[PDB]
Amino acid sequence: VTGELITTVNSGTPGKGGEVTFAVTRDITNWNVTSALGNNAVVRTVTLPIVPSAFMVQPDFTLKMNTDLLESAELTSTDPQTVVYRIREDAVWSDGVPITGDDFIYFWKTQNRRDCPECLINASYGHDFIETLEQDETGKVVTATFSEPFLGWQGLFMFLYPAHLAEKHGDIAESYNNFLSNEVPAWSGGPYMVESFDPGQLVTLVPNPKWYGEKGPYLDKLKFRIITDSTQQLTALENGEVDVIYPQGATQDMVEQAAGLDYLGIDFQMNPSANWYFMGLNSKAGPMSDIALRKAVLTAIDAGDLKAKTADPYLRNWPHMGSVMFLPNQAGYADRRGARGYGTGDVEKAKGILSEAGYKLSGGSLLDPSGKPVSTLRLSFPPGYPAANDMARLITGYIAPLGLKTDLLTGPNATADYLLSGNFDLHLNYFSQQVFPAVKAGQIFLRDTRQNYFGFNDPKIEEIIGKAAAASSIEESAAILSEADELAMDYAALFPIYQLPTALIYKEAILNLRDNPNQLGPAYNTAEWGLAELEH
């Protein structure tokens, strides 16, 4: 029985001074997390201490307005939708220049698809729904007017950049694509700022002397040490080379090892991630273009056994995920997978689905309706996730009674970015869920979107997602979006499995360090990090 909540784990009041080193798994070649090439958890973690945010995702998956930056943010009208931001007078960049509407306007122009068509952004995420963005004479009152309703407005302006510096480095595209992406940032609007960068080795941050927030910073230096081999991170922690690690794809052996290091002052936190494992099925081409084969495969997969073999031995009460649009804790969630018989391990039902579509078993091999053997299925998955490797082998075994064979494929060319209609049949990977399911869904399920790898092609799904993204609450959005989840599961091109576990493993002298099991991650509150005081 504990008094800590997910939002208050490891709380305390640290002393002043000292250093903390946090291991990260990628080198930094792009410093702009909002760009296409900078959008990953490492860049996000390393730049969260320097980039101010209007709202921040918290460990309970809520959005909290940043009261260091903002006095208020208010939806002041809905005819048309209007949001007013009042920036604190004392919010300033590290050179003393106030943070103002100039910074909101610059970011909006880079993200809105219109004013900077050459900006190489990750995604607009609704900034394009803002049609006018104006500021008062003081620069501290910013009014956004929308061309149509948009639920996810608190997700906007989550990363602000110094417009007065960008303007010294070319036009907007040049400054966004070059200055803000390629240069080590000399500026900050947060508690820390970069002192030095040793490529491939170490980012060193120091306090921003003009930090304007309520708390911190407490450390003399905050360092991010680059360790690309994530399996060497626990050794580095034990040796004192780093004080915090946050590896992806934690295993039972990793948990047991970390637990054995308690005598060295090491502790750990683990939670269900916003990242969720899935198996995608190639509905565009190859054997999986036949929905009957997709449904038969999904019905034969035994999801209980999959989780029993790969999660249950070291993770208690770990939830199945039976939706492709909602995590188990989000409004709208239901087991739409199991409602359709997917994941039930039901070989006889799967064989019936195949027989009713004209397939036949001959000599232990499945024949397509024309009479030709179904090809060996190409099941690919990216490296670095032992659970995915184990699940690929288990899935091979579940479908072998259907007369199907698999070829297991991996390596650096087996990433989602490199998928082609012609180079896979099944693919195991993960998606990262967002606070607004309808916003994430618009990136995955629409024709011609960046993450529609498995061939969803349904104007009704797209219409539903658009209505859900226009709703006035997350709850109403979920009620609307549930219909799209049903239709997406009917199509059987995406099979949800379960959430990845996070693993934050660290020296317990560090206070206010806690898991934030979402894309924003543990560096959401570095102003509060510090070392516990020893006794005088």
Burial annotation 418-430 (CB, 10 A radius, 16+ → b, else e): ebeeebbbbbbbb
H or E element, residue 444: helix 437-444
Using CA of residue 222, residue 516, residue 108, residue 181, what is the dihedral sign?
A: positive
Pair 358, 369: CB distance under 8 Å: yes
Going through 61-174 in order, the beta strands assigned E by DSSP cover 63-65, 70-78, 81-87, 130-135, 141-146
273 closest CA partner among 56, 432, 390: 432
H or E element, residue 24: strand 19-24
131 closest CA partner among 155, 159, 150: 150
Using CA of residue 32, residue 38, residue 44, residue 47, what is the dihedral sign?
A: negative
Please report the DSSP string for 165-203 in residue order.
Answer: HHTTSSSHHHIIIIIHHHSPP---SSSEEEEEEETTTEE
Please give the structure tokens belonging to residue 196.
């030095």
Alpha carbon separation from 338 to 47, 295, 486, 491 (Å, rounded) = 41, 12, 11, 14
Resolution in Å, one decimal, please: 1.4
Alpha carbon separation from 134 to 28, 89, 112, 120 (Å, rounded) = 34, 17, 15, 24
Amino acid type, 276: W
Using CA of residue 414, residue 417, residue 418, residue 420, what is the dihedral sign?
A: positive
Q: Rounded distance, CA 45 to CA 68, Å?
A: 19
**End-to-end CA distance of the chain, in Å?**
32
Alpha helices in 112-171 (DSSP H): 163-166
Alpha helices in 213-290 (DSSP H): 233-238, 252-260
119 closest CA partner among 188, 190, 181: 181
Q: Rounded distance, CA 187 to CA 284, Å?
A: 47
Q: Which residues have C-beta within 8 Å of that of residue 420, sequence separation ≥ 6?
A: none
Phi, psi of 38 (to 5 degrees): -90, -5
Q: Rounded distance, CA 327 to CA 403, Å?
A: 33
Cα angle value 417/231/524 (rounded, 5°): 70
> What is the C-alpha radius of gyration for the chain, rounded to an integer number of angstroms?
24
Please give the structure tokens belonging to residue 390.
């184990």
189 closest CA partner among 95, 57, 67: 95
Amino acid type, 96: G
Q: Rounded distance, CA 320 to CA 20, Å?
A: 36
SS3 413: helix
Cα angle value 324/326/327 (rounded, 5°): 105
The experimental method behind these coordinates is X-ray
